Ligand binder design. Structure first.
Ligand SMILES: OC[C@H]1O[C@@H](O)[C@H](O)[C@@H](O)[C@@H]1O
Ligand SMILES: OC[C@H]1O[C@@H](O)[C@H](O)[C@@H](O)[C@@H]1O
Ligand SMILES: OC[C@H]1O[C@@H](O)[C@H](O)[C@@H](O)[C@@H]1O
Ligand SMILES: OC[C@H]1O[C@@H](O)[C@H](O)[C@@H](O)[C@@H]1O
Ligand SMILES: [Mg+2]
Ligand SMILES: [Mg+2]
Lengths: 730, 730
């Protein structure tokens, strides 16, 4: 009420020019020259900035606020996706930890580092569910499962904001992308999303909800159509659901030019009508295109919008700036004016031990034939592949203020680990792609892919020599970061062809072969799974990537990471995901069942799959009672044992099935998990509690109710577990 | 009244045992031995038969009806998909004609032939819209566009039934599959369908509606879930939409065991509860599984169903049998008991001139480099490929009572054409697949593909010899019919690997190359499009396939056929189709648009694409008026000229765009077309009439309304190349 009183007072004093100015979100570029945007903050025509990210630069613009009548402060935002200056695994990587704390840790440091440079807000977390591997931004998300993505969506918000949004070591979480962006048609970015309302509520919205429940201060609106309505103009989404059904009190922010793009969507004839549609749907902040500033004065002066529309928008900005504390101290995150200069990129502001301890948790052991891993630090080891010495690629897509040169490549990481106890032979082995059209694309803007000018065959001879000169080969292969990024959708899911040639040749030398994969999406790995001797999924593991990868290769860390997005046998099985419906004709032999004929059926690697240097056993699953009363809770009991001879971590998973329902329900749904560290011979009893809240689903009219009847409870170390116990709900 | 009085009388007379008996649709098998089901028709426990298809066999069972108390007659049904005994192109083939009367002709003869053998009903037409090329049953449909599929869906019903359903040369049309079956997830048959209701009404339902509007006597319910509800138990679909919104008076028929499959869908705990769900949703007839007969007596005796449920079902059967005339004369289609047994498969009952004149219309010219086609009948010609001499493959999937040996292969068709005026060299060149697992599948049940036991390399040397010995090669390559059928979903869209090797080799001999393709779905043809000198798409062209194909190869017919389903550049661009939404970031090149980076963008061949031995010109498009009044119609005027040097057919197509709408509308939609035969130098003015009815779409609340504003009118010879003019609706 103190806040409402303060805001109302200020708004009662503001001209319309000034209330509309508060909605203008810009960045420095050719669109907005810095010296023209400085003049505009002075005349009170700007509301916030993004992509300005250093203390002297934020201060230099904040310092313009004083020349304006109402002296209203800016906030600054940035794409703090998976790190500011120290870069953690890409989010898909982080998810594979199966540990909130680990994810939380990555978030806190990001905020710490961002706030340290003067940043008020991160456009993060990206929380979009993804079941189509072809999509360029699958990297940014946490995988295919609702339960886990929703869970981690909250953890990220809580960590960024903490308990006080005005704390100078806290940033506001602008959760994205609202909504359904990840279900785009054909995995083409920006493409049509068409979905039933029961699937919309059960599977794809819950993560956006959990961000509002954790108190996210802002929401970024997606670029996709929903059932034919662009989210930028979707009053159902931004008003009915977000505001009234969900009670979001915060700020809505447009995507980059998403308001003028209503012309290309075919919802507006021109800019004037695009502005109207967006402001009236529930869009507070207008990113970059400046439509709001050009058209809202004439839209109001001709009675096409209500003052109440401008007022709800302008009031949502000031409420953000107030919660951040920028009305108390505009410089609360920019230091005091005497304070001494410093180097922004100094090694002394990084958090390497953090980056390294996180990146360890997310690596996934896909194959290890006859205990080849872990490697000993003796003899000669060949390091071949175009990503071995790649700095720019390990820190993945959306790297923020991340610097390539400060990054530990997987070559350097191997050097650091062996010291002088073994020898490393390096050969590039292949460029990342043989296709010049693909190379032209990745280097259109900035040189981010190394092109070795030597013939492909030249590089291959060198590699085979190097391999014959070694005890075993370690192959650093897969995508450059520019391949799993915004607008970079793929029609193939295998390792690029130039590198698969390299892998065929290396296989032909008979020397044991270890595959180290870098990638921002699942990959088609049918060949590699039958040929190569061991495979490590390392995603893009960040600034301490190489170090974390070495630790796992040399057994300093027993890999514990597991898949949160099923691995297709080819681009032509898309989509596959663990929580599909059984259909009327399930494949279990049989020609006349739901299947392909021309390839094996199922995902290559199921959801929740990962190996360990040690072996684990689960005892028979016990349920407290076989009939549950309404309001009561149920207990699921199982003993996890490390029966191998190495201290290692697994992830014990709880799946539910509702086998008889008013809807057709998935064969399996994730409902809980416990990440457990055990010494050899060490047991550990795990306890799962199951309430009514766990048993609910959205029927045809969105009635969110548990139905009485049998339920199936599954406990195992991956979704490929197939034995359960049953209880009856009364 | 006569009918109502007759039915009411009979029903007032029937015990429950007998009214339930009327719902039992069975066929002869291990489920139902012939001599046990004979005993059952005598105790009045059977209602209809399917898959019994010869006069003596139908008579032998009809003849059992006399020993029953109420002497109620059976009807007999069969899968008359694209022919009974004379087999026309597969439906996708038929569609490519762009001529209703041609399609009508195929339908009439089918009915003629079917009724001749004693058949009352065909489970046809299949009318499901298909945008996913991987799906096994794409062959059965008419392609991806709503307007064209809806149009032909009615033509098929009208032709099967004629003007009188009791006529002994008419059958009843059971339209399928209701509903949305073709949008299955990942192209996997029987798999989940999830769709928004605005896209459901605009794009996928209209063809089922057009069949009810043409007076279809029956409707078959699909096996797919819709937004989580199995259609077999979907009261919204079978009662609200079908009965009360649409006013369907007729009969609903289950898919094969689709009622017991509600257990595997996860809607029912057991059979008893599956029966209840289905009978109460709107399912009259129970195909094969016999659940209705086992459970309806106890479901009614315990008040789980209403007598009104049994009565609505039993009344819908008798209404069908009455309309067919089987109460007037049970043998009206089974002759008088005087004639000789006669041979069913006699040459004198076929319709070859029909089959040949249809199959000509459906062939599509995809490429012709420097007028290589048409061929002269004047030298040596190599005929290579595993489908050149293939009888079983030309008559495609769902060939009914069709006989392979009566069919004209593409080899034989070429022999017939050249007589002794030119010389034919044959080499198989490759089996249809190199993969033994694929060959094992296609020959699981019946020997459908003859496998040459020689090594792949052996066959290839033979082919290259044959090719070197000739003036040019004609290659008969693509799918066996077992590859485009129910349950046969593909992960690849190219010609099988064994045959692509064969085509690379043949290309390498320098000899001019003609590709004759056989296939039941679009195919990935990027290589063939850049290499081969000409390509002909022949689908599976039926009993007179070879003859029709020769006629086109030797210029006896100028190819006029055009594509009704866009051709993907690879399985990884699925789905593509001409009537997609523009999105906010359209590509036509930028990086940040809705696209792939690792392949060229767009379909290989767009919807409505086909070439000709002659060339055609369209004059500037003229509109009747700049501004249309409500209730008024508009005229669209264009002059088509054959400016080439041969008499040929093209197809002039009318596309509409609504560029500003409450919904995001497709970039282009089909609204009309005119197939025009022209002599060289010969012109023809075409007139298109455009009403408000043409400009409607389903908004977010299913308001079927045209909005005032600009509309874009496009006329051209394919969805790709075009010119447009704009008009305003007031
Ligand atoms: O770069 C700022 C913003 O640009 C938008 O177009 C992207 O969709 C967002 O993920 C991003 O936060
Ligand atoms: O117009 C292109 C813009 O689109 C945004 O979504 C991208 O994230 C920006 O980096 C880019 O400048
Ligand atoms: O063959 C009888 C019927 O069986 C069903 O299960 C198929 O899906 C239909 O296509 C067919 O008409
Ligand atoms: O699965 C049993 C039956 O199902 C039908 O849909 C298929 O078309 C038949 O070939 C098969 O006999
Ligand atoms: Mg239940
Ligand atoms: Mg309009």
């Amino acid at each position: 009420t103190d806040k409402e009183r303060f805001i109302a007072s200020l708004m009662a004093r503001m001209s319309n020019a000034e209330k509309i100015g508060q909605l203008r979100l810009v960045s420095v570029g050719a669109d907005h020259p810095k010296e023209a945007l400085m003049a505009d903050i002075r005349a009170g025509k700007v509301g916030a900035i993004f992509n300005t990210v250093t203390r002297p630069d934020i201060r230099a613009m904040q310092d313009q606020v004083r020349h304006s009548r109402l002296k209203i402060p800016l906030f600054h935002a940035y794409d703090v996706a998976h790190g500011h200056r120290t870069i953690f695994p890409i989010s898909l990587g982080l998810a594979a930890s199966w540990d909130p704390e680990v994810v939380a840790r990555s978030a806190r440091i990001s905020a710490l580092e961002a706030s340290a440079d003067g940043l008020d807000m991160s456009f993060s977390p990206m929380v979009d569910i993804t079941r189509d591997a072809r999509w360029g931004r699958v990297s940014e998300g946490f995988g295919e499962d609702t339960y886990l993505t929703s869970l981690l969506s909250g953890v990220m918000v809580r960590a960024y904001q903490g308990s006080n949004l005005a704390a100078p070591d806290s940033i506001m979480a602008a959760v994205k992308h609202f909504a359904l962006y990840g279900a785009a048609e054909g995995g083409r970015d920006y493409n049509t999303v068409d979905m039933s309302l029961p699937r919309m509520f059960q599977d794809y919205l819950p993560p956006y909800k959990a961000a509002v429940d954790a108190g996210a201060g802002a929401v970024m609106v997606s670029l996709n159509t929903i059932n034919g309505v662009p989210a930028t103009a979707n009053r159902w989404l931004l008003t009915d659901l977000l505001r009234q059904q969900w009670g979001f009190k915060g700020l809505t922010i447009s995507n980059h030019g998403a308001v003028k793009e209503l012309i290309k969507h075919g919802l507006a004839g021109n800019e004037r009508d695009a502005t109207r549609l967006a402001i009236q749907a529930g869009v507070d902040m207008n990113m970059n295109d400046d439509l709001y500033s050009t058209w809202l004065p004439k839209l109001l002066a001709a009675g096409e919008i209500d003052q109440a529309d401008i007022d709800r928008a302008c009031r949502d900005v000031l409420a953000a700036k107030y919660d951040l504390g920028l009305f108390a101290d505009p410089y609360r995150r920019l230091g005091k004016p005497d304070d001494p200069p410093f180097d922004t990129n100094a090694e002394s502001r990084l958090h390497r031990q953090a980056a390294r301890e996180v990146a360890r948790e997310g690596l996934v052991l896909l194959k290890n034939r006859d205990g080849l891993l872990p490697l000993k630090k003796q003899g000669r080891i060949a390091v071949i592949g175009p990503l071995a010495k790649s700095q720019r690629d390990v820190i993945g897509s959306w790297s923020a203020a991340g610097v390539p040169r400060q990054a530990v490549t997987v070559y350097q990481g191997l050097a650091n680990a062996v010291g002088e106890r073994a020898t490393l032979l390096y050969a590039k082995g292949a460029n990342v792609s043989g296709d010049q059209a693909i190379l032209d694309y990745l280097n259109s803007y900035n040189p981010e892919v190394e092109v070795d000018p030597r013939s492909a065959e030249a590089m291959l001879e060198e590699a085979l020599r190097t391999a014959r000169d070694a005890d075993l080969v370690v192959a650093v292969v897969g995508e450059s970061q520019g391949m799993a990024h915004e607008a970079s959708s793929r029609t193939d899911l295998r390792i690029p062809a130039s590198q698969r040639r390299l892998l065929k040749a290396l296989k032909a030398t008979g020397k044991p072969l270890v595959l180290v994969l870098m990638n921002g999406r699942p990959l088609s790995l049918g060949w590699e799974q039958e040929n190569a001797d061991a495979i490590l999924e390392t995603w893009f593991s960040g600034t301490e990537g190489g170090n974390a990868i070495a630790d796992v290769l040399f057994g300093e860390h027993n890999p514990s990471g597991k898949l949160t997005m099923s691995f297709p046998r080819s681009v032509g099985q898309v989509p596959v995901y663990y929580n599909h419906l059984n259909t009327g004709r399930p494949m279990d032999p049989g020609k006349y069942t739901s299947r392909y004929f021309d390839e094996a059926n199922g995902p290559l690697y199921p959801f929740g799959y990962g190996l360990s240097y040690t072996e684990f056993s689960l005892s028979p699953l016990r349920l407290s009672s076989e009939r549950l009363a309404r309001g009561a809770t149920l207990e699921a009991r199982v003993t996890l044992s490390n029966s191998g001879k190495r201290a290692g971590a697994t992830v014990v998973q709880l799946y539910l099935q509702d086998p008889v329902a008013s809807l057709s329900r998935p064969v399996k749904e994730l409902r809980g998990f416990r990440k457990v560290m055990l010494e050899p011979g060490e047991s550990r009893e795990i306890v799962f509690r199951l309430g009514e809240a766990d048993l609910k689903f959205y029927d045809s009219q969105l009635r969110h109710t548990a139905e009485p009847g049998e339920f199936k409870v599954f406990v195992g170390l991956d979704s490929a577990q197939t034995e359960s116990r049953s209880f009856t709900l009364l």
